[PDB]
Write a protein that holds these residues in place. Structure first.
Motif, PDB file in Angstrom:
ATOM      1  N   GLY A   1      18.138   7.025 -25.106  1.00 26.70           N
ATOM      2  CA  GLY A   1      17.673   7.288 -23.744  1.00 26.70           C
ATOM      3  C   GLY A   1      16.494   8.254 -23.717  1.00 26.70           C
ATOM      4  O   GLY A   1      15.357   7.850 -23.495  1.00 26.70           O
ATOM      5  N   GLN A   2      16.756   9.534 -23.980  1.00 28.83           N
ATOM      6  CA  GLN A   2      15.744  10.581 -24.050  1.00 28.83           C
ATOM      7  C   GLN A   2      15.837  11.327 -25.375  1.00 28.83           C
ATOM      8  O   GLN A   2      16.915  11.772 -25.762  1.00 28.83           O
ATOM      9  CB  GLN A   2      15.899  11.576 -22.892  1.00 28.83           C
TER      10      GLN A   2
ATOM     11  N   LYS B   1      12.765  10.902 -16.193  1.00 26.85           N
ATOM     12  CA  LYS B   1      13.291  10.764 -17.554  1.00 26.85           C
ATOM     13  C   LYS B   1      14.612   9.985 -17.587  1.00 26.85           C
ATOM     14  O   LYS B   1      15.606  10.465 -18.123  1.00 26.85           O
ATOM     15  CB  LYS B   1      13.340  12.143 -18.243  1.00 26.85           C
TER      16      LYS B   1
ATOM     17  N   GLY C   1       8.764   1.349 -26.858  1.00 26.88           N
ATOM     18  CA  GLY C   1       9.405   2.387 -26.055  1.00 26.88           C
ATOM     19  C   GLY C   1       8.836   2.489 -24.637  1.00 26.88           C
ATOM     20  O   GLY C   1       7.766   1.958 -24.343  1.00 26.88           O
ATOM     21  N   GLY C   2       9.544   3.179 -23.752  1.00 23.26           N
ATOM     22  CA  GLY C   2       9.121   3.407 -22.373  1.00 23.26           C
ATOM     23  C   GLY C   2       7.922   4.346 -22.313  1.00 23.26           C
ATOM     24  O   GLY C   2       6.790   3.901 -22.135  1.00 23.26           O
TER      25      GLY C   2
ATOM     26  N   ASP D   1      16.550   6.036 -18.452  1.00 24.20           N
ATOM     27  CA  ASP D   1      16.506   4.792 -19.223  1.00 24.20           C
ATOM     28  C   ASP D   1      17.607   3.827 -18.762  1.00 24.20           C
ATOM     29  O   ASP D   1      18.771   4.216 -18.690  1.00 24.20           O
ATOM     30  CB  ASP D   1      16.656   5.155 -20.705  1.00 24.20           C
TER      31      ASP D   1
ATOM     32  N   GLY E   1      13.831   5.094 -24.493  1.00 20.13           N
ATOM     33  CA  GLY E   1      13.395   5.341 -23.121  1.00 20.13           C
ATOM     34  C   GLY E   1      12.208   6.295 -23.072  1.00 20.13           C
ATOM     35  O   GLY E   1      11.069   5.877 -22.886  1.00 20.13           O
ATOM     36  N   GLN E   2      12.467   7.585 -23.250  1.00 18.51           N
ATOM     37  CA  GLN E   2      11.447   8.624 -23.299  1.00 18.51           C
ATOM     38  C   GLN E   2      11.500   9.374 -24.625  1.00 18.51           C
ATOM     39  O   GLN E   2      12.564   9.818 -25.045  1.00 18.51           O
ATOM     40  CB  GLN E   2      11.624   9.613 -22.139  1.00 18.51           C
TER      41      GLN E   2
ATOM     42  N   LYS F   1      18.493  -4.759 -27.760  1.00 18.96           N
ATOM     43  CA  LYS F   1      18.120  -3.502 -27.103  1.00 18.96           C
ATOM     44  C   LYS F   1      18.426  -2.208 -27.884  1.00 18.96           C
ATOM     45  O   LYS F   1      19.056  -1.311 -27.327  1.00 18.96           O
ATOM     46  CB  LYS F   1      18.633  -3.512 -25.649  1.00 18.96           C
TER      47      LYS F   1
ATOM     48  N   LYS G   1      19.207   0.013 -19.725  1.00 21.40           N
ATOM     49  CA  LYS G   1      19.263  -1.105 -20.687  1.00 21.40           C
ATOM     50  C   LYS G   1      19.710  -2.453 -20.107  1.00 21.40           C
ATOM     51  O   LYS G   1      19.616  -3.470 -20.781  1.00 21.40           O
ATOM     52  CB  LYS G   1      20.131  -0.721 -21.888  1.00 21.40           C
TER      53      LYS G   1
ATOM     54  N   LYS H   1      14.854  -2.070 -19.179  1.00 21.63           N
ATOM     55  CA  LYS H   1      14.862  -3.193 -20.131  1.00 21.63           C
ATOM     56  C   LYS H   1      15.324  -4.537 -19.556  1.00 21.63           C
ATOM     57  O   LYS H   1      15.221  -5.554 -20.231  1.00 21.63           O
ATOM     58  CB  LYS H   1      15.680  -2.847 -21.375  1.00 21.63           C
TER      59      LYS H   1
ATOM     60  N   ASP I   1      12.277   3.977 -17.729  1.00 23.69           N
ATOM     61  CA  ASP I   1      12.240   2.761 -18.540  1.00 23.69           C
ATOM     62  C   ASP I   1      13.343   1.782 -18.117  1.00 23.69           C
ATOM     63  O   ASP I   1      14.505   2.162 -18.038  1.00 23.69           O
ATOM     64  CB  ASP I   1      12.364   3.183 -20.010  1.00 23.69           C
TER      65      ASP I   1
END
Lengths: 73, 73, 73, 74, 74, 74
Positions: free
Chosen positions: B30-31, D38, C29-30, D40, A30-31, B26, D42, E42, E40
């Motif tokens: 995450g971070q 920040k 990646g993001g 994410d 993600g980050q 995937k 999926k 997906k 982000d």
């Protein structure tokens, strides 16, 4: 007399090696964040930040076939 | 007198080695965060921060096949 | 007398190595961020930031075939 | 003989379904803040922030009327 | 013989299905703030921010009337 | 013999489906802010920001009327 020398070879001899037929579906984090006053790298340093590597080395994987179809009367 | 020399070979000889038919669906965190006054790397350092490696070495996986179809009268 | 020397070879000898038939579907990646007052890399440093590498070395993978169809009366 | 077949039908058959006759007076009107950093995801995301859509769906609400009249003499 | 076949039908068959006769007075009117950074996704995203769409769907609501009158004499 | 086949039909079959007779008075009329930076999307995005669309779909609402009258004598 007769000699009927008819050997048949239908062999498959095969190498399948390294990265074959894999599925990599939406890879990645993600980050990723790095914060500093200084980044200071000075002898044979390897650094990876949020990067993706697919890496394959195949020094192997060779094939050998030898046949000696000798006949003598 | 007759000699009917008819060996039949159907052999499959195979290597399947390394990374094969895998599913990576995937991948990733995450971070990831690194915070400092300094990052300081000075002899043969390896650093990985939020990165993905898929890495395959195949020095093996070789094949040999040897046959000696000798006939003598 | 007769000698009927008719060996048949239909063999396959094959190498498939390195990166073959893989699927890489939307990699990456993001967000990737690096922040510093200075970045200072000075001897054999390797650095990767948010990059994608597909890399393959195949110094191997070779094939050899030998046949010796000797006949003697 | 005399026959007087004189039925009278004044009936009503009614269906009232869904959102009928409502009053929605100053809906929303306040303060919605989303600060978001920040993150994410999926898998699938559905999100509503400060939304007031009027969504109406009616696969039903059809009417069937069958009636059948016969007079047989001898 | 005298036969009077004089049925009277004044009936009503009605359907009222969906969003009918509502009052929506100043919907919204407030303050929606989204501050979004460093995110982000997906997979599929559906997002509504401050939306007020009027979406109407009617696959149904059909009417079927069947009548059958017959007089048979001898 | 006398026969008076005089049926009377004044009936009504009605369908009211979907969004009928609603009042939407000053919808929206507020403040919608989206500040959005450094975002990644790998699959389909549907987004509505401050939308007020009037979307109407009617695959249905069809009418079938079947009548059959017959008089058979001897």
């Amino acid at each position: 007399v007769q000699i009927v020398y008819k050997p048949v070879d239908l062999s498959k001899v095969t190498s399948k090696c390294g990265s074959l037929g894999n599925i990599h579906h939406k890879p990645g984090g993600g980050q990723v964040e790095v914060k500093s006053e200084k980044l200071d790298f000075k002898d044979r340093v390897q650094s990876k930040i949020g990067s993706l590597d697919n890496i394959t080395h195949v020094p192997g994987g060779g094939n050998k076939k030898i046949e000696t179809h000798k006949l003598t009367f």
